Write a protein that binds this ligand. Structure first.
Ligand SMILES: [Ca+2]
Ligand SMILES: [Cl-]
Ligand SMILES: [Cl-]
Length: 335
């Protein structure tokens, strides 16, 4: 584990060619002294380096702040990084994200898989954790690394194009998000990529409140989706503000992601236990055996696709993991 700190910044060489940079002119300073003319910054933050003037070295990937990026983008960035590494043996990739530090980590993990260092997600995640201790991958990030392994396997999985109808969501038992910690006032969002396509959220006073005896939260949705799906639930809260207005805030109860093309065709239920959910609050706000299920059905006809995914025009079969390293010895050591 080779780490450097200029000041606020933290540069971790996961390998000699893959650098993770943590949370301006100093960025440039460090990298120019060590890798002049041979680095690219893959900025995963939504907020860019427009006024940097070292921006000519920055690829603005603009990934979601909290959620795993769409599989298309995860794959596309890996390929760009690979091409950059191929272009000159002195080239290095510098990965940067906000400090929602899962973004850097999933990119690095995906890169291990893309470059054939590993074929299954566990060993990749283990190498990643050993290189970047302290930053955990959410279950959605791990799930997506699983998707990358499927796509890139010796016999690659071909994601289907059937849309998925999500008939409803059921959450049980009822979790503890109100002030008295005995219930919640929940609403659900469904997104594709970062685009919200449906919400059950309505006026605060219309929102049903749930207590322990309600037993479960059952919300019919009736939405049909294809691709990278995000399903989230929040607790809605109202507070008297200055001016005495109702300040309405929300506290996230959970989030989960999946890609419809990886759901087996005969699936009618998707179930997520607490360990399989992202973005949970403190454990005391959840009942035992907390779980979320989605009642679903895959449709019979392919969806007509606007854009084709980059894995359809790419084969990793020939890719050598030596590309990640600057010598055989570094390579062998890493294993
Ligand atoms: Ca492979
Ligand atoms: Cl409340
Ligand atoms: Cl409530």
């Amino acid at each position: 584990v080779t780490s450097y700190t200029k000041g606020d910044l933290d540069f971790t060489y996961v390998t000699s060619r893959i650098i993770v940079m943590s949370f301006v002119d100093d960025i440039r300073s460090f990298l120019d002294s060590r890798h002049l003319d041979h680095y690219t910054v893959y900025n995963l933050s939504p907020k860019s380096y427009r006024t940097a003037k070292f921006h000519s070295r920055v690829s603005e990937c603009s990934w979601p702040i909290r959620q795993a990026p769409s599989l298309h983008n995860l794959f596309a960035v890996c390929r760009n990084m690979y091409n950059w590494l191929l272009q000159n043996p002195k080239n290095v990739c510098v990965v940067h994200c906000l400090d929602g530090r899962a973004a850097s980590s999933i990119l690095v993990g995906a890169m291990f898989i893309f470059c054939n260092l590993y074929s299954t997600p566990g060993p990749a995640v283990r190498l990643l954790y050993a290189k970047r201790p302290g930053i955990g991958l959410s279950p959605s990030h791990r799930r997506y690394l699983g998707y990358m392994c499927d796509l890139l396997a010796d016999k690659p999985y071909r994601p289907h194009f059937k849309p998925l109808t999500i008939k409803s969501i059921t959450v049980s038992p009822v979790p503890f998000f109100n002030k008295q910690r005995n219930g919640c006032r929940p609403y659900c969002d469904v997104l594709i990529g970062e685009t919200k396509i449906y919400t059950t959220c309505a006026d605060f006073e219309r929102m049903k409140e749930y207590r322990v005896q309600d037993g479960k939260i059952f919300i019919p949705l009736s939405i049909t989706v294809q691709g990278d799906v995000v399903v989230s639930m929040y607790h809605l809260r109202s507070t008297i503000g200055s001016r005495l207005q109702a300040k309405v805030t929300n506290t996230q109860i959970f989030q989960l992601q999946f890609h419809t093309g990886f759901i087996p065709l005969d699936t009618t239920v998707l179930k997520f236990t607490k360990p399989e959910l992202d973005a949970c609050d403190v454990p005391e706000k959840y009942p035992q055996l907390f779980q979320v299920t989605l009642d679903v059905e895959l449709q019979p006809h392919d969806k007509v696709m606007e854009l084709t995914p980059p894995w359809e025009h790419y084969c990793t079969k020939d890719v050598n993991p030596s590309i990640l390293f600057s010598s055989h010895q570094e390579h062998q050591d890493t294993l």
